[PDB]
Structures are given as structure tokens and as C-alpha cells.
Write a protein that binds this DNA or RNA. Structure first.
Lengths: 119, 111, 47
RNA sequence: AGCAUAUUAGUCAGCGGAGGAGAAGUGAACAGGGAAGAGCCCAGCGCCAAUCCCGCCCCGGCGGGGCGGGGACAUGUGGCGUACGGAA
RNA sequence: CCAUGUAACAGCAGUUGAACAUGGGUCAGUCGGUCCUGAGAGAUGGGCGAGCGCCGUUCGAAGGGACGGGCGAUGGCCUCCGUUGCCCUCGGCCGAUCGAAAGGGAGUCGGGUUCAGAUCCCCGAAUCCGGGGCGGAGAUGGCGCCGCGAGGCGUCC
RNA sequence: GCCCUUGAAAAUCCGGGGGAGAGGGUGUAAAUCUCGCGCCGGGCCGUACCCAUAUCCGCAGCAGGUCUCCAAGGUGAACAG
RNA sequence: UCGGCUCGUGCGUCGAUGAAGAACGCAGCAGCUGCGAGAAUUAAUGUGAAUUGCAGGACACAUUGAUUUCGCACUUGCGGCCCCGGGCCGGGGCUACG
């Protein structure tokens, strides 16, 4: 009751064990260094930034380059205890990343900016 | 009255709390960027460095106490002299018998 | 149309095209008198 | 004084591999004098797996001791012994 | 580039400048890349090679993936799927991979706004892809007790 | 019409054939080329400007060279002058 | 003349625990130099009141006390496996050949 139907010999499947290391190769996990305080460096305070603050309900920040929109949004929410509608990002020709964080309609970007220190 | 490592030598949660306070202070200083605050930027940065250094040293000394006596330990807890040094007095019974039967003698001449 | 690496190279080359701070002329052992300045038309980047 | 053998030259360039040293153990050698100085080990042939590697307990070149399981090994590990001889 | 300000350079000059100085400016699921393979480049097997390597690209035990069943997945403690080995079972070669900002490739438009950005910002109206509600669809139909009820029951189809 | 020239590939997407199966017992159940609504999400990188009798290459603000899109009236056959 | 050249002496120590080299970044206010998101340096020890171009260290008088990037691919492109947290997002650990 064992007949080869096909004329091709394939390599039979064999057991593949999961690793059970006798020691971790690293004593401790590497600490995350792109935390919320490292994500937002400082708010941009320029005439265009002030226009965005007072007209678009948008805060302008300079952020880390490796940060993405999800990380920037979460970091802003945690640092300033606020809600974010959306985040647009660009990388400036000097290499810094600039983020326009549009806040929720129920939040006044002017009051929040005053709390932060700008305007 | 800055932060000094001896005063930090404390539980992990309290050290993390102090680190978070320092991070908030540094963020406020960067937003502010007066002469006094512009000077405080470096003080707060070095205090952050000091607290993190104390945290890492405490963690690694605890890890070294933990893995002491174990045959296998993480590579960073293993001595790092030099790749060549990490890669002697055994004798065969024949050589041992040769040394025992014919040891080097202490002798003087012309006496 | 730029890549990320080319743009970062250009940003670094831009941040180096500024004059020396004036107060450096007041240091004790200062021999510099002005800035390795580059002009976009006079000298071309290594690309 | 051309040039092809020769010379340039086992040299430049090229490739591989180290160590604190390595390697050795036109046109040279031996003897002689110095610097230094140091000798040894297997296989094989014989006798007696006597050999090696890899959970628990006790003491910054991961070893030592005790206890118990797995493997290597008879297609040959270890001890004695290899030319100056060796064993009985 | 934009604004502001103002010896050398702009083969005369300049109250001007792509010059000099200071400070700003480039915002996307929908426009591209990213994905595809095209000529081709190039690993593994194999061969060659003193050797760094290079020849070769189909000339080797080259599948690691399939709804379905029981032991043990019990885990929420089994609705549906994170569970292992096996068969009842299937799964061929264009063997990895790279190669287009003009080729292929779903889906965003109108109005307004700046000193310098907008199919990217705002207002408005859409759309594509991926991931546990409501409605509709599956569809009310055909011996016989009361009934000429179009009443529900009783049964079968 | 012309070719002794016959004018990409793949990703990717869809229809069909077949029928293993699943569904519920008379009020529905399985299931929707997936039908109408409703809910959530779409990360990363580029994006300024010049694009050429001074922003590119030619040693330069050089009569050179450097791929494209749109393009009105008259005359006139006319993207001629 | 705080640089060379030449001679001599001692030592003679790189790297997957990831080197040499490269890139990017880091100062209150370009280069060189020094460093690595703890970035113009942290800790410790010794030393001892400076650093300095410019105001800006309560320097406990027990003067503790001044002086990163360079599993598959190279476009930050695309994954897979196991955990953790927040509800898909974020974090950690893995995943080269011989």
C-alpha cells in the first residue's frame, strides 16, 4: 500500500524545531530612543506657522526624521493632552522634518499654543 | 543643586519618574529657546545623561549578579579582551613521568 | 525628483555655506579670518 | 654599444595566508671562528576500552570534586614505547 | 525660489541683480516612486579555477503551502480562528533576486487662499483598496377539524 | 492599403465549464458575479525654483549644444514669408 | 620655529561581543577637532578652584568638588515568526553563508 504515483522524487518534509536558546544573546532589550519627548523637538514659530495656528487650527512642529505620522500624532496627544484631526509632514531642505498637526474642531489651536509657550 | 549620581544610587520607578520630569523640563527649555534658560539646557541634558547612566549601571550590575554561576550568559556580559585573546598547563602522563624521574638539578661547578 | 540620500547630502551642503561667527575672531589663538564657501554657479557639487 | 640565449630577475606589478616575529629545525657548499643553544612525539609492532565528549549537589582565561544518564569509539581511544633501540 | 537690507562680482554704470547679508518657503490613500517584467543583470546547485574568484540561469532530495477528521488544539473553553504529526488530499519548469519618475499598473474633482506651497492647505462634492450593524435577496407555496373567513391549528410534500 | 518587416512580457483582474460539498425542515437555514445603506483605516520617500541668447554642459551671465506639451487674427495652398 | 627628515630603543595589542573605512547628526551663541539621540560628552578615580570670545554653575565647605545609519532588496522599498501595550498602531526579540 505504498506506490509512487508521480515520477518525481521530492524532498520529504521533516520536523523543524522552534529555537530554545540556553541564554539570551543580549542581556536586556534595547531601550526605545524614539520616545515621545524625542519625537517633537520644538514648535516652529514663524509667520507662516502663526497663520497655520490662527487660521487652520494647525500646530507646526519640528519633529524627528524617523518619526511617521502615527508616531507624531500619538506623541502630540500624549505630550499636550489633546486630540489630533490629522497630520501632514514634509522634510525641509535643511534636513529637518516639519509636521502640520491639524487639531480636532473642539480644540482651539491658539489656546493650546499659548499653553505650550508659543504665541 | 543639580543631580548627582550618589544621590541616585533608589528604585527603578522613582528613577524613571525623575527622568520623565527632566525630559519635560528639557522640552520646556527647548520651546523657550533668556540667558538662564539657555544655560539650563546643558544642565538638564547632562542631568538626563546622569540619570540614564545610573539606570543602566544598576540594571547591568543586577544582571551580572543574576547570571553569575551560570555556564551560558549573554555575550555583552562576557569578557571582551580581544577576538584573538578570547580564542595550557595540561601535560601528558608521559611528560609528567619524565619530569618526575629527571627533574632539573641545582648544581655548581669548580668547588 | 530626488532620493532621500541625495536630499540629505544637499541639506548638509547647505548648512555648511554660512560665514564664520564674528566672535570666533576674538578667541585667544584664532588664526581664521573668514570661511570653504561654495557658490552654486562657481563650483559644482560632487554629483 | 645591434639582438634572439643570457642579463634585468625569481625582481616590479598580480593572488592567497599569518605572527609578534615568521619560516626553518652570474655564482653557492663544506671545513674554521663566533651569537644562541634544547630537545622531542605519533603511526606501525606488542601487552593491559584501562580512552574521550555532552542533569543535580559542593567550591570577567568555565575549571575542580561527587552522583546519574546520552553519545563517540573495536573500520581502534588511552597507558608503556618509536631507532640514541624497546619489552620481558 | 520669497521678503527685507546693501565693498568685491555682474568686462560702462546702477538707487539694480541668479551678487552679498539676514530671515523664511516645498503639506497627498487619489500626482509620482514604491509593484510588474522588457532588453538584460545576477545569486544557489553544479562545473572550472594556483587564487581573488568566474562560467553558467535551468543547465539539484529545489513544495514550508491547501477548505475538509481524530488523538490534545479543549481557548476563548470549542460560533470562528491563533494547535501540533499523520495520512484519507492536492500543490509541475519558465526557480532566488534586480531591471522603466516616457512601457503595464485601482482610485480626485470644482472653488477659494500665500511674499514665496497647493489636484497636497481650507471649503464643498466624490471615489478606490483593505478590514462586523441595518435593509433587501434566499421568499409563504401546494390532505382536510371547524370554513362558502382568504381563520389558525393537525399532517405530508 | 504595406510588409521575404507581422509590430512585448509580466504583475494584476474577470468570466465560464465541472462538481466534491454545505443548508433547513415548514419557518426558515446555509450563501450573497456579492445588491442598497452604515462603521474604521490608507504608513514611507519626492514636491520650492530655473529648464536656457544669464539657474544645465561647454573654465564664463559663451551667437554653441541639450528631450517634450498648448499655441489665436489677416494674407496666402500652407505650422512659408 | 609647538614642523619635517634620519638613527636608535622598548613594546608589538584589529574584527560577527561586529573592525578598518564611510554617512549623518550632536555646542546658548561654519571649518578643524571631540563625540553618538546619555551625542562639544555620563559614571568612577586622581587632582584641585577654574572655563573663558561673550552676562548665564547656589561650585552640598561633609568646596562631590569648578576644572545612530552604512530577514529579502538597496528604493530608509517589502516581509515573516514569537511576545508586550494601546485599538490597525506602537515597542521588544529573532530571521545571512559556510
Amino acid at each position: 500500500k505504498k506506490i509512487r504515483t508521480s515520477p518525481t522524487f521530492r524532498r520529504p518534509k521533516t520536523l523543524r524545531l522552534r529555537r530554545q536558546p540556553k541564554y539570551p544573546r543580549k542581556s536586556a532589550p534595547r531601550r526605545n530612543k524614539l520616545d515621545h519627548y524625542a519625537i517633537i523637538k520644538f514648535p516652529l514659530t514663524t509667520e507662516s506657522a502663526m497663520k497655520k495656528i490662527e487660521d487652520n487650527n494647525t500646530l507646526v512642529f519640528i519633529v524627528d526624521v524617523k518619526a511617521n505620522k502615527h508616531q507624531i500624532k500619538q506623541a502630540v496627544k500624549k505630550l499636550y493632552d489633546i486630540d489630533v484631526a490629522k497630520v501632514n509632514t514634509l522634510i525641509r531642505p535643511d534636513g529637518e522634518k516639519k509636521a502640520y498637526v491639524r487639531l480636532a474642531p473642539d480644540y482651539d489651536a491658539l489656546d493650546v499654543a499659548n499653553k505650550i509657550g508659543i504665541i | 543643586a543639580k543631580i548627582k549620581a550618589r544621590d541616585l544610587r533608589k528604585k527603578k520607578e522613582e528613577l524613571l519618574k525623575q527622568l520623565e520630569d527632566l525630559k519635560v523640563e528639557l522640552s520646556q527649555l527647548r520651546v523657550a529657546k533668556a540667558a538662564s534658560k539657555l544655560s539650563k539646557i546643558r544642565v538638564v541634558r547632562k542631568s538626563i545623561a546622569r540619570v540614564l547612566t545610573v539606570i543602566n549601571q544598576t540594571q547591568k550590575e543586577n544582571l551580572r549578579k543574576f547570571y553569575k554561576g551560570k555556564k551560558y550568559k549573554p555575550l555583552d556580559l562576557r569578557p571582551k579582551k580581544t577576538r584573538a585573546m578570547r580564542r595550557e598547563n595540561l601535560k601528558t602522563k608521559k611528560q609528567q613521568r619524565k619530569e618526575r624521574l629527571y627533574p632539573l638539578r641545582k648544581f655548581a661547578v669548580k668547588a | 525628483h530626488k532620493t532621500f540620500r541625495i536630499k540629505r547630502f544637499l541639506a548638509k551642503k547647505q548648512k555648511q555655506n554660512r560665514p564664520i561667527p564674528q566672535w570666533i575672531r576674538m578667541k585667544t589663538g584664532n588664526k581664521i579670518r573668514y570661511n570653504k564657501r561654495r557658490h552654486w554657479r562657481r563650483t559644482k557639487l560632487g554629483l
